[PDB]
Ligand SMILES: *Cc1c(COP(=O)(O)O)cnc(C)c1O
């Protein structure tokens with residue numbers, strides 16, 4: 008009933024509260040909850056269901072499989088996926104009524120042929136590369152793509168339901184690239200409208216833009232991270248300041264507590280040495296579980312009413328902590344990350360420790376780690 | 390039938406060849422194939438089956454669940470797990486005939502009580518903390534533990550089948566700690582034997598020790614990493630020099646190829662800027678898939694017959710590469726890691742790029758990534 012090694016407790020109520028907090032931030036726009044990568048490590052279906060119930064009108068995933076998984080779980084409503092490769096399940100996605108993004112001619116031709124076999128009109132969204140340089144259509148190819156799209160629409164094969172883009176530095180407030188991208192978007196959106204595209208939705212904002220630039224809202228805001236109670240960056244503030252509540256709490260049970268003499272080496276490479284006769288504790292969770300190895304010696308953990316730092320190298324499935332004089336016993340609970348409001352270490356605390364960003368921390372929590380759900384409605388977790 | 394985004398191809402024949410290569414390294418000792426953490430990211434059951442067939446007499450996992458999963462898949466033979474927490478499935482493991490490690494009195498008492506309910510004798514192995522400072526019994530507590538064990542044996546509740554330890558710096562050839570640990574092991578092993586313990590197996594070596602110190606072989610060698618064709622460290626040499634063959638090859642299909650002008654920013658933070666009008670390619674695999682974000686700008690990838698470096702920041706599910714003048718098209722295959730013998734980038738190549746160790750690279754490949762099996766016997770993959 009309760010994992011005895013390490014587990015992730017997901018508060019579905021924090022999720023519902025967050026999308027409401029976020030919906031109030033962009034009152035004029037609709038909210039798309041991005042649940043890609045297993046809902047950033049929190050569990051795709053349960054979180055998708057919870058977000059929807061709290062007001063999310065759109066669901067967004069990266070791959071078709073992720074979107075199809077949502078459908079197979081009986082989730083209804085608008086869903087969109089944008090990461091496609093030649094040969095993907097165009098037919099299956101069209102038949103399940105999922106909005107697919109198009110960034111190249113190759114994509115448009117595969118969806119057109121698939122809409123035929125399916126015998127239905129595919130809802131496509133044109134992505135413009137306004138400067139990120141990742142996916143999307145470059146300005147110099149936009150004209151051609153927009154034309155091919157309105158033509159495919161005429162043939163009744165597809166129907167352009169949206170025009171969108173994505174920011175590269177929205178998490179860095181006041182970055183010059185932000186404005187440059189927004190203008191490029193406006194100008195590219197305009198050209199599409201004049202040439203014949205009448206989209207249902209116009210969107211470009213992610214979590215950081217949604218929280219900072221209301222001029223980026225438009226018809227839809229694509230919020231991923233903020234929905235799970237984690238702030239895109241310390242620059243924007245803490246989840247507390249943003250009015251967000253962390254949904255994930257990673258817990259582990261101590262596997263051992265013992266006394267060691269001064270001068271004793273701890274873990275691989277012996278990068279840590281006891282300063283005196285002290286009590287060492289073994290946390291049974293390592294990098295294969297999602298604890299970044301790069302956080303060796305820095306990672307914060309709450310054990311015996313005090314924050315402890317990872318003693319030495321973090322291993323594949325465990326790492327040790329120095330309890331100093333304090334005492335604890337095997338089976339005692341240790342909190343690796345949770346709510347700063349409860350005096351626990353947080354996702355950002357670990358991002359700093361591992362020299363990375365909070366995004367990677369929560370998302371990289373291993374499948375080996377069981378998830379336990381609280382809050383939301385009973386049928387949300389299944 | 391074939392993943393169109395990103396997938397891991399596991400050569401089961403490389404696995405069989407490796408355990409044979411390794412068995413020849415320690416002719417006098419028995420080989421335990423460590424398949425913990427989903428066989429270091431290669432797939433626990435298929436790899437466990439293959440290794441066994443090639444000569445592995447023992448199977449080793451960290452958690453009871455991992456070991457129980459092996460049993461539930463019909464795998465027969467000796468299995469051992471060492472990472473336990475109070476409340477674990479002692480009974481279930483005893484009933485499935487799995488050797489459990491004991492490092493504290495608390496563990497001994499839980500197994501004794503469980504052997505009663507089970508109505509059988511539990512095969513336990515005493516772990517000595519010879520200097521690693523992780524799990525195991527500290528020298529100052531050894532006497533007491535050994536006594537409690539021989540007493541529990543008398544009561545017919547348990548049966549000490551082994552005495553073992555683990556190295557902290559065996560991957561660093563000529564490290565002083567290695568010898569110090571080996572001597573501590575010999576002396577601790579002796580005391581156990583005199584006091585009444587007659588073990589089936591005596592072991593302390595991991596992959597690096599097995600390949601370097603034949604005096605650490607004893608009755609059993611616990612080889613994990615080397616079994617998958619990856620070398621514990623560049624110091625020990627390359628898989629080629631060690632006579633090992635890499636079992637994993639990570640492949641991805643290009644999702645887009647487009648032309649961008651000079652001075653264009655690429656990915657989040659705009660940490661990369663095109664030097665000239667060039668061709669950018671989008672690799673649909675990111676850190677949520679196991680591509681370390683810390684390898685941003687350094688990660689090697691084979692595309693269009695040439696090694697390319699990750700252009701800018703690596704995202705959650707994708708990253709871009711600069712093809713310069715070369716040309717490729719969506720759907721073209723890119724190799725992220727494979728066999729250095731085939732001119733492909735390797736696990737170590739990525740460890741360097743991400744400032745980590747090859748161990749973390751293969752093990753952290755996401756569950757989102759499908760595994761495809763080749764070689765071995767047809768029933769191996771199921
Ligand atoms: C992941 C993603 C989002 C959501 O970003 P957050 O910063 O997590 O809110 C939005 N749009 C696209 C294209 C994405 O890939």
Ligand SMILES: *Cc1c(COP(=O)(O)O)cnc(C)c1O
Nearest residue numbers: 423555595596597611612613614
């Ligand atoms: C993982 C592990 C091994 C195997 O180590 P490799 O270096 O991968 O061969 C051996 N013993 C213990 C206790 C382990 O945890």
